[PDB]
């Protein structure tokens, strides 16, 4: 730096158009010794930036794709240098302008720190800090990584101002939701001859709610198919989802049966209805935000009712269909709506069937059915040794980290809803003229040592 | 419950209160047989389980008469003709005798719209399994972190 | 602990039933290792470190 022929350039970038500050980045593995001397040069450079060139900060000189070094250690997993920047008090009072923690009184036990949400919270800018945390860095450190001092107070900030106005909305706009449907079902003209001539203006009406209750249905039928092959307790716990969707699948259902012309639609119709009004009670709880162990058990218990509500009704298709498959004469095509209902009714245990006689071939239907029980009963077990086989070991950890990683993660996308006008409203953080005037973020601090 | 019940029954008129009524003096004297522990003082595991056993398990239930009950008085509505106001007491019976399984049912066909009905009780099932798999869940991730 | 022997024990046992499987043609060809000549060469195998002691 300091030379007699020619000096060395701190701003000067590579090909890759990182900085001196970026490649300490990259180097900073979390360890004891390599997390000791990086926040020794990183503390070098800055003040010796400085003090050769006033006017320009280090830290300001972006990348490639337009990162800092605080926004480079979210994206590789970096601590060490991630929780030096976030405390970054300098002393030389000429680099004071660029220090992130601050002091503002004192008295006594109670001491009134100073952190800067200088690019935590981008109101109106690019990308965040806090986004790279949650949406981008896919590091196992990010669990710990949200545990610094700021970000654990900073989300506390939104959820106490977005949490409570985002989940009234979520119970209003389900009931919403609930009395279209039941527009829709009292309203019936009930004829037995579905469907109907929509022409009546008045029964036009009704017709759009039906867009309304179906395209939700549909909605959440599609992504979760799509999210399990690529259970947000926070609000309303995981229990729900599954219930939900059991609303959204009678509701497809319902969709079919008067279009298909058999007037038994109204059964089911209403049955979602009983279920959409008691799915209500799950409203009742409030907000969680003390993580039980449980949360990450009732994702696999919806994972795997999914696919075991599949795996019965491919089952019970395919093996109707192979059925046809064995009649060689003429056969009828309406045998497989008849194999289909006689096979239904053995496994609830009707007896009620009407091709299949146990009579006629009883030392095979016994053994198939026999069979029948015991490929059911090892199905039943692989959901309570999923469970088992997950509450043991790492439970203890993860289930305190997800909760965590989860609460962060739907805030943010709380934040992403709201538009440009309502974000600079509940927008925390105060500007506190400090030097020769920023938006930074008031903490408190109580220690009895330092004096 | 089974008292208040009991108290119903010889007010409505049905004289059939005296199946009830020494029911649960049959349990009454054998609930006596808690009584013969003594008295516990050394605290286990099971004591903070019992109590969600009974948060749930009156949760259970009361979401299983207030569901009974309103696709009962469900299927009252769709009937449009006169229908009767004896039909809900005929439709409330048909329906607790499908959750058991008795197959004594008075109103319900299940020959004449056999599709509709399978598919309605294998859903059946699957509300049923998942709420007592909430039980199990609720007391798996309970009994792992912090129950030491 | 043992959830973590065995499936480490059989992630082992495994490998190696599957290099019983390949004939002796195939089995130089995917061998690991590498001929570093050193002294006055052998099949040994590149194991990389990061230190920062040492000095």
Redesign the interface.
Known sequence: TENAHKKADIRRQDSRGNTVLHALVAIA?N?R??TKFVTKVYDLLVIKCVKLYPDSSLEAIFNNDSMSPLMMAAKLGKIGIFQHIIRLEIKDEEARHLSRKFRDWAYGPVYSSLYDLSMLDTCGEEVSVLEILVYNSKVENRHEMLAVEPINELLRDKWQKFGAVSFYISVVSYLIAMIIFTLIA?YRP?DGTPPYPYRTTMDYMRLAGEIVTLLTGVVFFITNIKDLFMVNSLFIDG?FQ??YF?YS??VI?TAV?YLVG?E?Y???M??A???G??NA?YFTRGLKLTG????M??KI?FKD?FRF?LVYLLFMIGYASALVSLLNPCRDSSTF?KFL?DL??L????G?LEMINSAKYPAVFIILLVTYIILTFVLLLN??IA??GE???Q??KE?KQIWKLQWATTILDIERSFPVCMRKAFRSGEMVTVGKRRWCFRVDEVNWSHW
Not at 292 to 295: E, G
């Open positions: 593995d360890t010794e390599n009292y009930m229990s599954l219930l059991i699948v009678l259902i049966l058999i038994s109204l059964a089911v209403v049955f209805l009983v279920l009004w008691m009670l039980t162990y449980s949360i058990l009732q218990l009712l509500l709506s209902l239904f009714k496994t609830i245990g009707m009620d959901m309570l469970l088992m509450t043991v070991g439970v203890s289930s």
